[PDB]
Structure 1
Amino acid sequence: QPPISQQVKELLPVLAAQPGHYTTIHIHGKPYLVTEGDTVKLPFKMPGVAPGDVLRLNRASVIGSRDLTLQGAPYVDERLFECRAIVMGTESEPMRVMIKKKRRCRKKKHVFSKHKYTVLRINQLKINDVSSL
């Protein structure tokens, strides 16, 4: 695979050494700034998953700490970090009614919408050691 930059190989230990770290994962192209332990509530029902399934996220746009920040041009290389989540199940919203109406017309058309949402749980977010790479 493409070798990691020398500048990133010399500053990553300082990034992984600081107390806290955050990441901006990308699910289907949309970003989500999360940290280990956060509960992500996706705005869609992920098909083909059940509560207790482990997902390996591999599209990270930005991984950084307080002072430093690692940025990949399209995305950060997968070999540098390891972010995993667990499906916490599905959640729904209260049924909302939209009334489409025009003035001086009695017909009121109703639209009933009740969407489901997949809830994740970031249970791992660590930076790998690239001393070998």
Structure 2
Amino acid sequence: QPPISQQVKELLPVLAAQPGHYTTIHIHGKPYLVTEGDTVKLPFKMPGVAPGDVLRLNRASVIGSRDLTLQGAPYVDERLFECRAIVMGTESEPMRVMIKKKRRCRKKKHVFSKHKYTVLRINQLKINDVSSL
């Protein structure tokens, strides 16, 4: 695999040594700035997942600390970090009624929408030691 840069191999230990860390995961291309312990509520029902399934997130746009920020050109190398989530369940919104109507026309067409949403829980967000790599 492509070797990690020498500049990233010397500053990553300083990035992981700081108190807090955040990441910008990309689910189906859409970003989500999360932290270890956050609860992500995706705007769609992930198909083929039941409450309790563990997912490994491998597309991170930015993984930075207070002062330092690791940025990959398209994305960061998966070997640097390890982010995992757990499927907590599915939530739904209240029914919304949209009334499509025109002036001087009695017909009022109704549109009932009630979408489901998958809820995740970031239970692991750690930076790996790349001293050997």
Bin of the TM-score, shorter chain as denominator length: over 0.9
Q: 3-state SS of the aligned residue for 2:20? A: coil
Q: What runs of 5+ residues in structure 2 fail to find an aligned partner?
A: none
Q: 3-state SS of the aligned residue for 2:73? A: strand
Aligned match of 1:68: 68
Q: 3-state SS of the aligned residue for 1:79? A: coil
Aligned match of 2:121: 121
Q: 1:83: how far off?
A: 0.1
Q: 1:125: how far off?
A: 0.0
Q: Sequence identity, in percent? A: 100
Q: 1:79: how far off?
A: 0.1
Separation in 2 of the partners of 1:132 and 1:96?
55
Separation in 2 of the partners of 1:125 and 1:8?
18
- CA deviation vs aligned residue, 1:39-78 (integer Å, no higher than 9, x gap): 0000000000000000000000000000000000000000
Q: 1:29: how far off?
A: 0.1
Q: How many residues align?
A: 133
Separation in 1 of the partners of 2:88 and 2:103?
46
Written as runs of structure 1 = structure 2, the 5 A alignment for 1:95-114 is: 95-114=95-114
Q: 1:8: how far off?
A: 0.1
Written as runs of structure 1 = structure 2, the 5 A alignment for 1:17-56 is: 17-56=17-56
- CA deviation vs aligned residue, 1:77-118 (integer Å, no higher than 9, x gap): 000000000000000000000000000000000000000000
Separation in 1 of the partners of 2:76 and 2:32?
15
Structure 1 residue ranges, 4+ long, deviating more than 3 angstroms after superposition: none
Q: TM-score, normalised by structure 1?
A: 1.00
Separation in 1 of the partners of 2:11 and 2:109?
60
Separation in 1 of the partners of 2:97 and 2:80?
47
Q: 1:122: how far off?
A: 0.1
Q: TM-score, normalised by structure 2?
A: 1.00
Separation in 1 of the partners of 2:10 and 2:96?
53
Q: 1:131: how far off?
A: 0.5
- CA deviation vs aligned residue, 1:14-46 (integer Å, no higher than 9, x gap): 000000000000000000000000000000000
